[PDB]
Design a protein around this ligand. Structure first.
Ligand code: HEM
Ligand code: HEM
Ligand SMILES: CN(C)Cc1ccc(OCc2ccc3ccc(N)nc3c2)cc1
Ligand SMILES: CN(C)Cc1ccc(OCc2ccc3ccc(N)nc3c2)cc1
Ligand SMILES: C[C@H](O)[C@H](O)[C@H]1CNc2nc(N)[nH]c(=O)c2N1
Ligand SMILES: C[C@H](O)[C@H](O)[C@H]1CNc2nc(N)[nH]c(=O)c2N1
Ligand SMILES: [Zn+2]
Lengths: 407, 411
């Protein structure tokens, strides 16, 4: 009931009690673990609100105070009346920061309280959303000195007036099905690169074409918008030794800005809430270049290294994967763009873990996602036991808009 | 209830029905996941249903469920239990059990080989010296001059828990580790505590960086005794690198036979507390864990020095780079000497095939993602994007407290 977790590299033991607060469910049972599965009314709303407000006023050392009680009373009232309710800005911010704080899959959470919240709740149109998004992108980029941000569009009402960013990230590279058979650009984004044209995009049919924003406001049809290029900071990728690297014709964008998630605070459902921070190197280089179902350029890279690509036992894929990731980090640090290496980020996380166990009594963590996709066992998190559980406020997955939209 | 797993690299979807045959607990609940927790005297009361369960599986597998052979066997076992408070497995049953225990080992990426396991029945053993004999023949048989064969040796089951057979070594073959007065460690840091016990038990330690440890064996609950595996029986491979000639000079070598000996085999309620088993190495086990883990030989840095890497900023990925070269060297040294070894890409590929085959033919395949995924280059092996249900089946291999923590010293 008061669980412990052992780091095996260091024998350190943390005790977890925060999990007892856990409110939502995992997908696991006593009989089956699903830790490696990707995605396992006025009456429900009020308990949701109270729980949130209780933790909020507790966090400001005014638990049980007049303001607290009155606020709980005030919200309770508006709920009975309007069937929903609205969050004070302070609550909105506390909420946002805490959904990140509780994002069990996120290795970067040590930064969780330095989040810039943009209240875009007054928005009414796709054009408006576009204006708010450009503003976010510009702010977060900060000439390469990246800052974390989130922009929150009006909460769901009755599932009809839904605000949604159809892009999965604000900034992503187009991907096209070749008549040749293969795939040009980014394969992840193929179906999306279609929907854009299916909705009227004029694709430059290149490789690194920045996808257009497809914003949907108040449940209406979604509209296309193009991000001003001067707002899209990119880094041409080059190796600090292999000068044939730049020849490979590679660059990547500096701003990772996830847009398809649902943010939940005190029962309210912000279905558009694009947020961003900065890349861990391996997100672009292990994942965005070298996944089979992505840029898949490993073969060509090692080809250019004249490595024995005949048998797997030469570990050519590994050697190459390492150089590519060295290049990514090298180019970003060169162009004065924020990035963190996977050793540094995992180190920061262990500290953040220790910090949360100390000041908060625990920290939910999803080992399968926290461990970098390369060099796993030489990062400190590998040997770190982690408890996974779901807390509120949270970020949740949500169905792709094109599977839901009533046109 | 059906459950689906999806491979996100290939969109292949599989459907698990097997998880319904799962009894044992996971550690998990609906409000917490212990999926990354390393570790999450039995009466006639709870024995017979465990036995029936086993025998039922056993007779289904031989397509004789409900046969008179099956029913008499149940009866035979029943009566042997209520009379003797335990029972004995037939040879057929012991073999099936050991194989299935491996097959159910949800953390083992090597399971494709599960049906080809040589089972040595050492249930007639009575002394440590007898144990040394059995173990010696295991090692010789499994080693097969570098052409490794999977094998397990099974010592008598636990009776009253006061007469346990145990192998105190964690693996049959392992290098000593010595903590020095200055704080440094000579040999394998992973083995220091055991090395100490060994020394206290009268072992005369060479105190070299690569001393094969003695077997510390326990029979019928007696105090353990020391035995030196004859060196001609211990196959080793010196570690060199194919392009780096300075590598051999790091003075490295590893033993060829991985043979885990501290686990506990459970079959039909019976507990086999001494059941050393062996297969062959995946390269990363030696290369990534056995040299490069910060709590191991940690030649990561020296390899890095010799490569003249940029060890200043970690964002040079010098650690990553050295790690790769060390694993190249491990695989290369082994293949050159015709000692069986598998690389992580090969092993994971194999596993996916095995797993898919198991879903189709068995209705699932319990698998621990945290352990199946290799400790380097995770996402460029096919298991990384493979969803996996994890659950416990019997027969199984279980952890068990170190015997030095529980053992009652005769003297
Ligand atoms: C500032 C530096 C940050 C770093 C280095 C970082 C790092 C990461 C990494 C490496 C992942 C794994 C994702 C993958 O492999 O595809 C991840 C996931 C995640 N991040 Fe963070 N992040 C940062 C900022 C943020 C911010 C500002 C938020 C939101 C406020 C956030 C929320 C999340 C969430 C919810 C996930 C899980 C996504 C999922 O479940 O699929 N992160 N992060
Ligand atoms: C024949 C080639 C084999 C290969 C390549 C192989 C590979 C592996 C690897 C790489 C691990 C993870 C080890 C670690 O990182 O600590 C593992 C775990 C395991 N293996 Fe296999 N193995 C083989 C044979 C066997 C055999 C013969 C058995 C038993 C009869 C077995 C039973 C297990 C068990 C029970 C685990 C989980 C250990 C634990 O729970 O801590 N394996 N295997
Ligand atoms: C499995 N993938 C192919 C699909 C997938 C796509 C985006 C995903 O979002 C992850 C995510 C979320 C927030 C982040 C914030 C900062 C950062 N550097 N990476 C971040 C990464 C997760 C999964
Ligand atoms: C943290 N460690 C001390 C615990 C630990 C060490 C080795 C372990 O080995 C498991 C294991 C079992 C059987 C194997 C068979 C073959 C093989 N190549 N590796 C195998 C590896 C398990 C746990
Ligand atoms: C904390 C974590 O559960 C633990 O360190 C595990 C992680 N995965 C592993 N995977 C393998 N193959 N071997 C291990 O020893 C471990 N250790
Ligand atoms: C099968 C597994 O659940 C899936 O591939 C996960 C594994 N771990 C991951 N880890 C991170 N950081 N990001 C991911 O997308 C995934 N994918
Ligand atoms: Zn679980």
């Amino acid at each position: 009931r008061f669980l412990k977790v052992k780091n095996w590299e260091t024998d350190v033991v943390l005790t977890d009690t925060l999990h007892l607060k856990s409110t939502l469910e995992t997908g696991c049972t006593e009989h089956i673990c699903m830790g490696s599965i990707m995605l396992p009314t006025k009456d429900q709303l009020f308990p949701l609100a109270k729980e949130f407000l209780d933790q909020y006023y507790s966090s400001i050392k005014r638990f049980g105070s007049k303001a607290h009680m009155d606020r709980l009373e005030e919200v309770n009232k508006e709920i009975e009346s309007t069937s929903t309710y609205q969050l004070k800005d302070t609550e909105l911010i506390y909420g946002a920061k805490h959904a990140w704080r509780n994002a069990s899959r996120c290795v970067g959470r040590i930064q969780w309280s330095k989040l810039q919240v943009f209240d875009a709740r007054d928005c009414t149109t796709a054009h408006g959303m576009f204006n708010y998004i450009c503003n976010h992108v510009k702010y977060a980029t900060n000439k390469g000195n990246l800052r974390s941000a989130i922009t929150i569009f009006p909460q769901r009402t009755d599932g009809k007036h839904d605000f949604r960013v159809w892009n999965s990230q604000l900034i992503r590279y187009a991907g096209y099905k070749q008549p040749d058979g293969s795939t040009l650009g980014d394969p992840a984004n193929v179906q999306f690169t279609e929907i854009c044209i299916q909705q009227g995009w004029k694709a430059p049919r290149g490789r690194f074409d920045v996808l257009p924003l497809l914003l949907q406001a108040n449940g209406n049809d979604p509209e296309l918008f193009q991000i001003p290029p001067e707002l899209v900071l990119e880094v041409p990728i080059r190796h600090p030794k292999f000068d044939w690297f730049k020849d490979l014709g590679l660059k990547w964008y500096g701003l990772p800005a996830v847009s398809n998630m649902l943010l939940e605070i005190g029962g309210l459902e912000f279905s558009a809430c694009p947020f961003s921070g900065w890349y861990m190197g391996t997100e672009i280089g292990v994942r965005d270049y070298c996944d089979n179902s992505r840029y898949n350029i490993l073969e060509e890279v090692a080809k250019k290294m004249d490595l024995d690509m005949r048998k797997t036992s030469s570990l050519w894929k590994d050697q190459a994967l390492v150089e590519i990731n060295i290049a990514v980090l090298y180019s970003f640090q060169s162009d004065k763009v924020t990035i963190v290496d996977h050793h540094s980020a995992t180190e920061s996380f262990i500290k953040h873990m220790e910090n949360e166990y100390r000041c908060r009594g625990g920290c939910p963590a999803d080992w399968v996602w926290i461990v970098p996709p390369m060099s796993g066992s030489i990062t400190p998190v590998f040997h770190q036991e982690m408890l996974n559980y779901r807390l509120t406020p949270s970020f949740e997955y949500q169905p792709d808009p094109w599977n839901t939209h009533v046109w």
